[PDB]
PDB file of C-alpha atoms and ligand atoms in Angstrom:
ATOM      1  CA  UNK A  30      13.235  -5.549  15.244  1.00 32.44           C
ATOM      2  CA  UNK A  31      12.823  -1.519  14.366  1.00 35.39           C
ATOM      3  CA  UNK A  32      16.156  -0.227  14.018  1.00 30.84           C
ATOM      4  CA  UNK A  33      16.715  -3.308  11.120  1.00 30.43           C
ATOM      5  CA  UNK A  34      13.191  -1.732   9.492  1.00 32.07           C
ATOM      6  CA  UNK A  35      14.252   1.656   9.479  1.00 30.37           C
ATOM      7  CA  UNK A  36      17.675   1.005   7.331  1.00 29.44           C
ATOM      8  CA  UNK A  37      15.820  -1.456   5.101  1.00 29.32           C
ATOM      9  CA  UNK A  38      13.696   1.448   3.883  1.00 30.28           C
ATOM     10  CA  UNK A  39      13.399   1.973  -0.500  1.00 30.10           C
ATOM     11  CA  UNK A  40      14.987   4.145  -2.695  1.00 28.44           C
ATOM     12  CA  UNK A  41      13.307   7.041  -4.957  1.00 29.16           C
ATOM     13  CA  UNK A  42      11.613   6.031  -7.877  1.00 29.08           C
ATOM     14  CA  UNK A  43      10.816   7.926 -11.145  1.00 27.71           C
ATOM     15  CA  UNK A  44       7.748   7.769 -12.742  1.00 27.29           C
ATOM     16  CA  UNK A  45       9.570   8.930 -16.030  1.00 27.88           C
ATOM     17  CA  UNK A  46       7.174  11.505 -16.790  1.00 27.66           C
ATOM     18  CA  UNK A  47      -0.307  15.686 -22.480  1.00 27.68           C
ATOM     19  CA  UNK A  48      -2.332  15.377 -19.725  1.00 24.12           C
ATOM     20  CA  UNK A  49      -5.258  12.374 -20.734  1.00 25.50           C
ATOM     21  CA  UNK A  50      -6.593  10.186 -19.025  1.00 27.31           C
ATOM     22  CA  UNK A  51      -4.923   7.391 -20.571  1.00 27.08           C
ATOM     23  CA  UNK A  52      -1.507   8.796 -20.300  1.00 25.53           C
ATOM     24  CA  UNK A  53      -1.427   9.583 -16.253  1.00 27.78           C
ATOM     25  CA  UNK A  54      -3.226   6.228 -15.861  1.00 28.36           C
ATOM     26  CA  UNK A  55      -0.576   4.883 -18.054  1.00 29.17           C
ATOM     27  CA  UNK A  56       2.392   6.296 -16.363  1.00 30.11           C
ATOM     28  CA  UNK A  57       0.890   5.235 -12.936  1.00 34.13           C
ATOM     29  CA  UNK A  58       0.808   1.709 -14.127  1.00 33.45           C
ATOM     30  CA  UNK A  59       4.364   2.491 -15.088  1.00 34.44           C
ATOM     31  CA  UNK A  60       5.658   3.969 -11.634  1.00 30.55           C
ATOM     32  CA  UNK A  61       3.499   1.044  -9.525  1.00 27.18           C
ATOM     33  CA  UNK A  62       6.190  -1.640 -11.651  1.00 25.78           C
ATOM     34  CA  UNK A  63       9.118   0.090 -10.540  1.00 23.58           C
ATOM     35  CA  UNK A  64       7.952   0.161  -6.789  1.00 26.20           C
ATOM     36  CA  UNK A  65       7.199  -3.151  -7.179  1.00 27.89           C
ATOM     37  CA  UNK A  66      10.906  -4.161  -7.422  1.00 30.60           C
ATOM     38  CA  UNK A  67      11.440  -1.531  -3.905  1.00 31.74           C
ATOM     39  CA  UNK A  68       8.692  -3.873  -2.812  1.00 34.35           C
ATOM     40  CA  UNK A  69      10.026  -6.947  -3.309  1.00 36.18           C
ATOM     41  CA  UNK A  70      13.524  -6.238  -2.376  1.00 36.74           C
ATOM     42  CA  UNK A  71      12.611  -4.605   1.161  1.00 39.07           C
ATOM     43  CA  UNK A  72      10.233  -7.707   1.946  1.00 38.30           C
ATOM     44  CA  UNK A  73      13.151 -10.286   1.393  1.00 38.69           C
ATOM     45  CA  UNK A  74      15.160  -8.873   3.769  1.00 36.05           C
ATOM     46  CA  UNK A  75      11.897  -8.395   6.463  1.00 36.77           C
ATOM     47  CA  UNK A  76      12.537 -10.250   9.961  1.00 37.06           C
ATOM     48  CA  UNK A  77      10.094 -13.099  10.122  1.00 39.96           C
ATOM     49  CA  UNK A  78       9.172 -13.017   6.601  1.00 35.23           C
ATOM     50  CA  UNK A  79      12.204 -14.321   5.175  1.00 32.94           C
ATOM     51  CA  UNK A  80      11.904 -17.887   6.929  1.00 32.66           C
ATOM     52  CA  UNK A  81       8.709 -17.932   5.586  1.00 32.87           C
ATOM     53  CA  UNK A  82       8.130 -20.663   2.370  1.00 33.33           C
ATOM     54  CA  UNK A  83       9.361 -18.478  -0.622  1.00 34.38           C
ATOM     55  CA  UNK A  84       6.101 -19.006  -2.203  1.00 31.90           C
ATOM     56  CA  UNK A  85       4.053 -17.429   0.875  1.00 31.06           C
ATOM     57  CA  UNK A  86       6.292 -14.294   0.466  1.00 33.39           C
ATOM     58  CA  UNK A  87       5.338 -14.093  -3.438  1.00 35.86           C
ATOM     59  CA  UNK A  88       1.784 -14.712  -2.206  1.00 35.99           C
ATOM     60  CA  UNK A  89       1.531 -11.927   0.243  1.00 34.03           C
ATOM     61  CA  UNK A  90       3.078  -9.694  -1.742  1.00 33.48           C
ATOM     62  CA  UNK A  91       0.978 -10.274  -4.768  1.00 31.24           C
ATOM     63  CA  UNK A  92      -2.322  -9.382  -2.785  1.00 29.94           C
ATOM     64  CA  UNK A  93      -1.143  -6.522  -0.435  1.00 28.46           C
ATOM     65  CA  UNK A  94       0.518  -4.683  -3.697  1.00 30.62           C
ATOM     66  CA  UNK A  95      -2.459  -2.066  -4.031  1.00 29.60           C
ATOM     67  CA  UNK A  96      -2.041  -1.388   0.025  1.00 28.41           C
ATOM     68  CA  UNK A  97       1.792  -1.288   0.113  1.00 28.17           C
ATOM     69  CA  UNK A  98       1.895   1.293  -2.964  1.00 29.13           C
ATOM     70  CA  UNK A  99      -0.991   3.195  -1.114  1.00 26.71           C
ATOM     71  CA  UNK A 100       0.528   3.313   2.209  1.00 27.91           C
ATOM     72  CA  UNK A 101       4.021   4.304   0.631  1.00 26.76           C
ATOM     73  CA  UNK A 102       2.289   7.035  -1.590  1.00 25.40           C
ATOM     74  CA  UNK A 103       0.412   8.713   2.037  1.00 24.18           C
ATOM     75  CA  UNK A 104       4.017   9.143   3.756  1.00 26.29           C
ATOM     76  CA  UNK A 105       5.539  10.637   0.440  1.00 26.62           C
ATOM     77  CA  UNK A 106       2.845  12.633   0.714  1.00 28.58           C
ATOM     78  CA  UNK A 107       3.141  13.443   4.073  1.00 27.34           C
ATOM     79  CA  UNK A 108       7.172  14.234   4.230  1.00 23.94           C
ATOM     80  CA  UNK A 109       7.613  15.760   0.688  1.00 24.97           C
ATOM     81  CA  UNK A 110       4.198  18.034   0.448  1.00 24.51           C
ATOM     82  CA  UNK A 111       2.695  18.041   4.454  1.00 24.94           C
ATOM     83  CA  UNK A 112       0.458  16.101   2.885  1.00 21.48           C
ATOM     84  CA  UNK A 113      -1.260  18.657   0.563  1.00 21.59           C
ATOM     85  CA  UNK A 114      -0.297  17.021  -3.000  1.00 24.31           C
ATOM     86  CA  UNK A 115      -0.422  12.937  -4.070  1.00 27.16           C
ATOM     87  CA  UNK A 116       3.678  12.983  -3.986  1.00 25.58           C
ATOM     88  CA  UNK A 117       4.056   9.568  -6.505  1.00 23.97           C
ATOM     89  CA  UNK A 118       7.119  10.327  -7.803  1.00 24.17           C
ATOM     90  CA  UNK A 119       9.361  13.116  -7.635  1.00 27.36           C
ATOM     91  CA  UNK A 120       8.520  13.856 -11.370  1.00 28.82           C
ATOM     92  CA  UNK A 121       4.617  13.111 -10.987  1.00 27.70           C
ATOM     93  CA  UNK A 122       2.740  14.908  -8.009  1.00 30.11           C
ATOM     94  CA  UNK A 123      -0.421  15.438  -8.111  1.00 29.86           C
ATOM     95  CA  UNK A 124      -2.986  18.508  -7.433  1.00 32.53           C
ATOM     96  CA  UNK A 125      -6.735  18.583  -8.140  1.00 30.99           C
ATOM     97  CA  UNK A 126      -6.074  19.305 -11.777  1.00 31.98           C
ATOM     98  CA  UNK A 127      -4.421  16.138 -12.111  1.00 32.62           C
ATOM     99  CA  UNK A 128      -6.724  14.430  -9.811  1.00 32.58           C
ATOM    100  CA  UNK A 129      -9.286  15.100 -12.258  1.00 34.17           C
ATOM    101  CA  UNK A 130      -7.311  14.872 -15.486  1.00 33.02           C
ATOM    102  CA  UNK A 131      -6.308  10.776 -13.724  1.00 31.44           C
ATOM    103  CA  UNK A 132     -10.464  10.223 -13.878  1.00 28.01           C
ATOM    104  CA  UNK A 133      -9.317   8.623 -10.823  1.00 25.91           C
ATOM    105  CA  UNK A 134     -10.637  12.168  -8.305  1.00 25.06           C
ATOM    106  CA  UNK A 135     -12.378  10.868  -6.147  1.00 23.38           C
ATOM    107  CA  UNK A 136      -9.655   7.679  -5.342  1.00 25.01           C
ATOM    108  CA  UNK A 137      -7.215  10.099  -4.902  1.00 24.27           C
ATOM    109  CA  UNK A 138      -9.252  12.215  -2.788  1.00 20.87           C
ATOM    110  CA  UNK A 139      -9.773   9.328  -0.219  1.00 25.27           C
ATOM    111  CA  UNK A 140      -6.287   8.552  -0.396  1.00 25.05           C
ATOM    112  CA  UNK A 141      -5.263  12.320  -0.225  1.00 23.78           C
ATOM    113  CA  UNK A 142      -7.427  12.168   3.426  1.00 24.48           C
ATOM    114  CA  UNK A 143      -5.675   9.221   4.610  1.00 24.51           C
ATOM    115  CA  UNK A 144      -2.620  11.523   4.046  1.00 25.68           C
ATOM    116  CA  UNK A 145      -3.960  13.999   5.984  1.00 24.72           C
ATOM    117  CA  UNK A 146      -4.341  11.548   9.050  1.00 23.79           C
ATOM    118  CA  UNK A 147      -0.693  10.768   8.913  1.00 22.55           C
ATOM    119  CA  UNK A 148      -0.564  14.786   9.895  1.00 21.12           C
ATOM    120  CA  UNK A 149      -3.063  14.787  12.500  1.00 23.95           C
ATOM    121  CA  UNK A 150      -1.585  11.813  14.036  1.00 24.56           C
ATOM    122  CA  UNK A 151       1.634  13.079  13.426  1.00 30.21           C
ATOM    123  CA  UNK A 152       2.637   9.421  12.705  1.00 30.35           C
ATOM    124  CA  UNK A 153       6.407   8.581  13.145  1.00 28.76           C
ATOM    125  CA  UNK A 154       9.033   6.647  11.436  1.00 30.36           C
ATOM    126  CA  UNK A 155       8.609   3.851  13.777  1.00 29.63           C
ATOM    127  CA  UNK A 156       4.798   3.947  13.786  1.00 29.55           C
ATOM    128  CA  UNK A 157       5.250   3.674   9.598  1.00 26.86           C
ATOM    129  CA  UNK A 158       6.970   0.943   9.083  1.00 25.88           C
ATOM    130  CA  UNK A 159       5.407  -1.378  11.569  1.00 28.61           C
ATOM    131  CA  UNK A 160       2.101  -0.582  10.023  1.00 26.79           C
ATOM    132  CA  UNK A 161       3.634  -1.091   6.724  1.00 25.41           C
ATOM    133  CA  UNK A 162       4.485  -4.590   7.460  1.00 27.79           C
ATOM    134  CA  UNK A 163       1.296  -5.150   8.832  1.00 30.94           C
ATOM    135  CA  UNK A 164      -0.322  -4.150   5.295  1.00 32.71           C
ATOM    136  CA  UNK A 165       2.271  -6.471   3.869  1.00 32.86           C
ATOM    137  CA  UNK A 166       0.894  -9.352   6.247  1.00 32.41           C
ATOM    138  CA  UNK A 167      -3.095  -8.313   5.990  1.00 31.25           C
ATOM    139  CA  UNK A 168      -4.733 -10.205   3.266  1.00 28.58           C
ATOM    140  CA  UNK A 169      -4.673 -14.465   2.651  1.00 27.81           C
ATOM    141  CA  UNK A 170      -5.880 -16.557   0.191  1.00 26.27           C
ATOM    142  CA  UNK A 171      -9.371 -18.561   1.115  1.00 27.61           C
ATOM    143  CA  UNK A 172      -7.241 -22.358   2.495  1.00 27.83           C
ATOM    144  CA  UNK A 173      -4.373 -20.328   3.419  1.00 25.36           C
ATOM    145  CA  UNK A 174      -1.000 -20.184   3.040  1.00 25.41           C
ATOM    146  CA  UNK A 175       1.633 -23.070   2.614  1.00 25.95           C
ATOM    147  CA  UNK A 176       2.922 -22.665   6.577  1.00 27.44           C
ATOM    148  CA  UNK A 177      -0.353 -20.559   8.440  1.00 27.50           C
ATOM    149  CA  UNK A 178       0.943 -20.766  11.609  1.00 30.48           C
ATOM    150  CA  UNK A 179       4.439 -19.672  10.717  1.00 27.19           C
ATOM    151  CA  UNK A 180       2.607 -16.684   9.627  1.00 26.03           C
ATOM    152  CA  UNK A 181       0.175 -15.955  12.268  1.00 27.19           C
ATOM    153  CA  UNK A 182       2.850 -16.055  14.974  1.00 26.30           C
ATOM    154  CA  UNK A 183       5.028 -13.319  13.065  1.00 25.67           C
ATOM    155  CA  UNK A 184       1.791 -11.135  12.424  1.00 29.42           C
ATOM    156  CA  UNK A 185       1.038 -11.643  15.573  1.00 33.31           C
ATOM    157  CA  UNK A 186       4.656 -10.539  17.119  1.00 32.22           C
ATOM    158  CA  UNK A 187       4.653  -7.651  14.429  1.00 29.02           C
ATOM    159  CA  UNK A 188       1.310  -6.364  16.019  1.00 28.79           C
ATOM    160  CA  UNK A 189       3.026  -6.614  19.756  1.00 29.15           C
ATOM    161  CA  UNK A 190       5.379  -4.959  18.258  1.00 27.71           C
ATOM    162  CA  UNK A 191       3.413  -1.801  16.815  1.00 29.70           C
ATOM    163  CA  UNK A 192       1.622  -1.741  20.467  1.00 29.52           C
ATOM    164  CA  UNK A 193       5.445  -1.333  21.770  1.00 25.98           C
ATOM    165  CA  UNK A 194       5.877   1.770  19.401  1.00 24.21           C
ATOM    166  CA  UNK A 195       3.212   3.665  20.199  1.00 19.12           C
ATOM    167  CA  UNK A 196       0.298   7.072  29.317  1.00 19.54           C
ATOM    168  CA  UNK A 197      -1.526   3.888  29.208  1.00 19.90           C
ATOM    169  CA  UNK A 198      -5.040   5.504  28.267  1.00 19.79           C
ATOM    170  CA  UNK A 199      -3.594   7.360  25.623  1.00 19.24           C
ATOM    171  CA  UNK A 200      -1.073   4.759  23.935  1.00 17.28           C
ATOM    172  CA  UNK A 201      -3.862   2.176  23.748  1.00 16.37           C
ATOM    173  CA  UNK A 202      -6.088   5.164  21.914  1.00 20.31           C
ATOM    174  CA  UNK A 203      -3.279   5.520  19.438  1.00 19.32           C
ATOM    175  CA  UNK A 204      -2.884   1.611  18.991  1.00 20.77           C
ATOM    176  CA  UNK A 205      -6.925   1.802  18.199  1.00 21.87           C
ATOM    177  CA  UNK A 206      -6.322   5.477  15.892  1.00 18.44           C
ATOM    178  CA  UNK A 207      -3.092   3.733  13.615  1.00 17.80           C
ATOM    179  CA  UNK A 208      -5.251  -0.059  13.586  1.00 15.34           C
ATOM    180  CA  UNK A 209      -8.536   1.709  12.713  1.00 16.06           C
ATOM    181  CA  UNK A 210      -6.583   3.508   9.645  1.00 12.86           C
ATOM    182  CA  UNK A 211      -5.089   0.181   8.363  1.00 11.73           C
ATOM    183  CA  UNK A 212      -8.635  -0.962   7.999  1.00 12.27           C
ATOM    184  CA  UNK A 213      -9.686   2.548   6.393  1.00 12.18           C
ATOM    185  CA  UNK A 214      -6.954   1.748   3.845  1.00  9.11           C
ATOM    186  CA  UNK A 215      -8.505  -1.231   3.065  1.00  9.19           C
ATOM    187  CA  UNK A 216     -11.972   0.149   2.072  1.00  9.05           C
ATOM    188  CA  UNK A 217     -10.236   2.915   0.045  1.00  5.66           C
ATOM    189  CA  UNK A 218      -7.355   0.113  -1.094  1.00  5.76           C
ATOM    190  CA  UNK A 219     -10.320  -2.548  -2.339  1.00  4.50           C
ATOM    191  CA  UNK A 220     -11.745   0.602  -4.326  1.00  5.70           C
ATOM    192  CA  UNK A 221      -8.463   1.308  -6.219  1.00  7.88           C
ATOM    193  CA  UNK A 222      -8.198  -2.594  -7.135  1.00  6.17           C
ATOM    194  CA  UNK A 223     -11.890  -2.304  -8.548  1.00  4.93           C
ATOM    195  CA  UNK A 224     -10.979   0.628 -10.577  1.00  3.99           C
ATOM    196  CA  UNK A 225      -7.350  -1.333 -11.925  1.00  2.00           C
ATOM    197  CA  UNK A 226      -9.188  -4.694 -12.736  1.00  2.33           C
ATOM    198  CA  UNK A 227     -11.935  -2.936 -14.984  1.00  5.57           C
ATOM    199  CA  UNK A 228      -9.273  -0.925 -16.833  1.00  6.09           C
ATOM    200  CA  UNK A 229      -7.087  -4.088 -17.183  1.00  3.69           C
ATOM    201  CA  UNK A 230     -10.634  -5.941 -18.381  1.00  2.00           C
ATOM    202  CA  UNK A 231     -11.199  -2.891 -20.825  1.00  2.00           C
ATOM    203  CA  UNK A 232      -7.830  -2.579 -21.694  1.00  2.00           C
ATOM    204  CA  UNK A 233      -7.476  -1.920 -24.986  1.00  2.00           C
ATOM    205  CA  UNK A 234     -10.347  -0.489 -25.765  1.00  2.00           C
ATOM    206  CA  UNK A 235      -9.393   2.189 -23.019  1.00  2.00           C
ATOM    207  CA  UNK A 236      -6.068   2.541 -24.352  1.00  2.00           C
ATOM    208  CA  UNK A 237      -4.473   2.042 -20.594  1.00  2.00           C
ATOM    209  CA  UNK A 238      -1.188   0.216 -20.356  1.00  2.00           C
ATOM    210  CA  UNK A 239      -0.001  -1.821 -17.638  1.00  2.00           C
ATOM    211  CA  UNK A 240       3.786  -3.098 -17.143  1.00  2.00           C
ATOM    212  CA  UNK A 241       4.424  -6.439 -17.785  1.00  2.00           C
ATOM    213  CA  UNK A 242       5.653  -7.339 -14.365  1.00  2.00           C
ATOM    214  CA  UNK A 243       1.908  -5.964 -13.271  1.00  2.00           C
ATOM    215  CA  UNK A 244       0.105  -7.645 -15.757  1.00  2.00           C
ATOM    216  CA  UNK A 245       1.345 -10.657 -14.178  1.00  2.00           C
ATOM    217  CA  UNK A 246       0.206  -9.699 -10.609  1.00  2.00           C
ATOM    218  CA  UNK A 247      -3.115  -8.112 -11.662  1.00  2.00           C
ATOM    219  CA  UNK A 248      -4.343 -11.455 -13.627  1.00  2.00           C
ATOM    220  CA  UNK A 249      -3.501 -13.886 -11.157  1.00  2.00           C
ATOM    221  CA  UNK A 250      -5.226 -11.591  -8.298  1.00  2.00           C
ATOM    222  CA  UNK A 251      -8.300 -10.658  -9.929  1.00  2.00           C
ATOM    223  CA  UNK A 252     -10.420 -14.247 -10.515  1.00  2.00           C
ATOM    224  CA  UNK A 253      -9.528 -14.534  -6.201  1.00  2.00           C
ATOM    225  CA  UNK A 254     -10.290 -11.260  -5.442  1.00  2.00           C
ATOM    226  CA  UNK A 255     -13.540 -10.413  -7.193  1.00  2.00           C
ATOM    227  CA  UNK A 256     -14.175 -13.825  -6.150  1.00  2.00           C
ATOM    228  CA  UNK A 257     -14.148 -13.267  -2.961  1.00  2.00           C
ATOM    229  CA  UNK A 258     -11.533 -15.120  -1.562  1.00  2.00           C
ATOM    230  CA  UNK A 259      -8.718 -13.049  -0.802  1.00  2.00           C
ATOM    231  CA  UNK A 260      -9.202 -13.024   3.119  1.00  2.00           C
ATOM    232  CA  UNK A 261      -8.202  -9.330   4.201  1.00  2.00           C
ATOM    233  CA  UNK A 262      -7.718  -9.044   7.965  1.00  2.00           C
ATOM    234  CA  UNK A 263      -9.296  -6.663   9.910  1.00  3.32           C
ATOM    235  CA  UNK A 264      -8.451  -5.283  13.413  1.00  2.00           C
ATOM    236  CA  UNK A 265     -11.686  -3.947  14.380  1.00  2.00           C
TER     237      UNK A 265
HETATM  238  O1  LIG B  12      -5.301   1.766 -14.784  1.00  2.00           O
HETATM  239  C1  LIG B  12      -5.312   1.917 -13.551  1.00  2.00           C
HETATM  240  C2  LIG B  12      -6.637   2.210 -12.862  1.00  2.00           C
HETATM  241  O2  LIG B  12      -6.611   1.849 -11.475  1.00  2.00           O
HETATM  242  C3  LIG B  12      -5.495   2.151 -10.722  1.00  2.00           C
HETATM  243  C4  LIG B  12      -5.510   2.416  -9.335  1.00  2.00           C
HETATM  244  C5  LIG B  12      -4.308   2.705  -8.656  1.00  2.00           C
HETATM  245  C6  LIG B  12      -3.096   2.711  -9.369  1.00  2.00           C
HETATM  246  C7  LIG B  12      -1.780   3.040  -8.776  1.00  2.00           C
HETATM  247  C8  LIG B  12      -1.517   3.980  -7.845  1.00  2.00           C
HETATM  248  C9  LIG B  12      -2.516   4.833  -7.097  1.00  2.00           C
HETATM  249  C10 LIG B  12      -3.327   5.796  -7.668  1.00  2.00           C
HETATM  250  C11 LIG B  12      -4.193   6.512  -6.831  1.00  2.00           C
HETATM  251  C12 LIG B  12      -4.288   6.309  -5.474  1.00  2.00           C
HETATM  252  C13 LIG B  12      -3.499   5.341  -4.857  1.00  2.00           C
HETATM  253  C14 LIG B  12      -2.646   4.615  -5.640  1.00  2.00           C
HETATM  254  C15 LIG B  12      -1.767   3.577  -5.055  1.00  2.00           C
HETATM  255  O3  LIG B  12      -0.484   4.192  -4.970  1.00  2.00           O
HETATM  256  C16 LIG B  12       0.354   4.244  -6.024  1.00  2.00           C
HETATM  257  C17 LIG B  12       1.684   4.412  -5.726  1.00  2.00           C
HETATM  258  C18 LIG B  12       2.576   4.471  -6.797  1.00  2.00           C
HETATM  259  F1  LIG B  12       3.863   4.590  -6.522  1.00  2.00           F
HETATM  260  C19 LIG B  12       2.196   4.357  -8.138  1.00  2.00           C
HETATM  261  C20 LIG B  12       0.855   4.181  -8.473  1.00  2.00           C
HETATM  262  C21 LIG B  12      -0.096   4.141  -7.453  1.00  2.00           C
HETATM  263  C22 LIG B  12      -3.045   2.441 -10.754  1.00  2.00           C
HETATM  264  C23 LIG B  12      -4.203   2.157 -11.468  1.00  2.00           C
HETATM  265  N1  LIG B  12      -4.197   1.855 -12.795  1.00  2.00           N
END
């Protein structure tokens, strides 16, 4: 199960990179298409996931994209920089300067934190791409998916699975530390997709551009989401 998750890992992406507002957000929008493809081919060749109805996989990968990116961005962040800059691309890390110059500082300050857990925790390899999965497998539509129970049994082995990874006291503590921050991604995650669907709304009066690929994603996930009915899964 693990050692077929740790070769199936992506490859580095460049963002292609003045400083506005409009121009970071821009080239975020840019680097978040790119990943998108890393995305989509490391979830085809996921255990489990593959068998699943192709249409489930598009599905699930549509509404976790904001977490996956997220969760990918923290561990950049955590190997490249020790977690003190937003590593996005090898050509686009961030600081507080361009924190602020993004008008996105506060986002990136809750997602700069969850970095810092990874460092506290001092979360490994294995521990990563479990949870990564798990993000990948965390939010449904309302009726569910075309085969539910295919799904629940392979979330459901993939959570055995992360309880494998990680004393008895203290290995059930870290199970409850690493689920605990997959549901503090989600609060910060649900934030980022509020911020992305009002500057996809506002679009052109904002002068923000989104990738084609994205604008695709974003317009089918926004009338479920700020509807209500994506179903995001929570541990605790
Ligand atoms: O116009 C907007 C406003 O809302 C956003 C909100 C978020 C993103 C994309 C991010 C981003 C920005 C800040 C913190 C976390 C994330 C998610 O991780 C990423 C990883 C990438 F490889 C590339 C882009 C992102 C993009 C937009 N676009």
């Amino acid at each position: 199960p693990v050692m077929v998750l740790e070769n199936i890992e992506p490859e580095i992406v460049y963002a292609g990179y003045p400083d506005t507002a409009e121009n970071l957000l821009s080239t975020l929008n840019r680097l978040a298409g790119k990943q998108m493809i890393q995305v989509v081919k490391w979830a085809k060749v996921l255990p489990g996931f593959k068998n699943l109805p192709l249409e489930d996989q598009i599905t699930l990968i549509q509404y976790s994209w904001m977490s996956l990116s997220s969760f990918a961005l923290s561990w950049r962040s955590y190997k490249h920089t020790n977690s003190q800059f937003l590593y996005f691309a090898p050509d686009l890390v961030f600081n507080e300067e361009k924190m602020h110059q993004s008008a996105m500082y506060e986002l990136c300050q809750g997602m700069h934190q969850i970095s810092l857990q990874f460092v506290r925790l001092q979360l490994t390899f294995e521990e990563y791409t479990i949870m990564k999965v798990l993000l990948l497998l965390s939010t449904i539509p309302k009726d569910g998916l075309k085969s539910q129970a295919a799904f629940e049994e392979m979330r459901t082995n993939y959570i055995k699975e992360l309880r494998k990874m990680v004393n008895s006291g203290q290995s059930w503590q870290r199970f409850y530390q690493l689920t605990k921050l997959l549901d503090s991604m989600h609060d910060l995650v649900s934030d980022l997709l509020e911020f992305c669907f009002y500057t996809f709304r506002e679009s052109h009066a904002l002068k923000v551009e989104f990738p084609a690929m994205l604008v695709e994603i974003i317009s089918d996930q926004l009338p479920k989401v700020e509807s209500g009915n994506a179903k995001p899964l929570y541990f605790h």
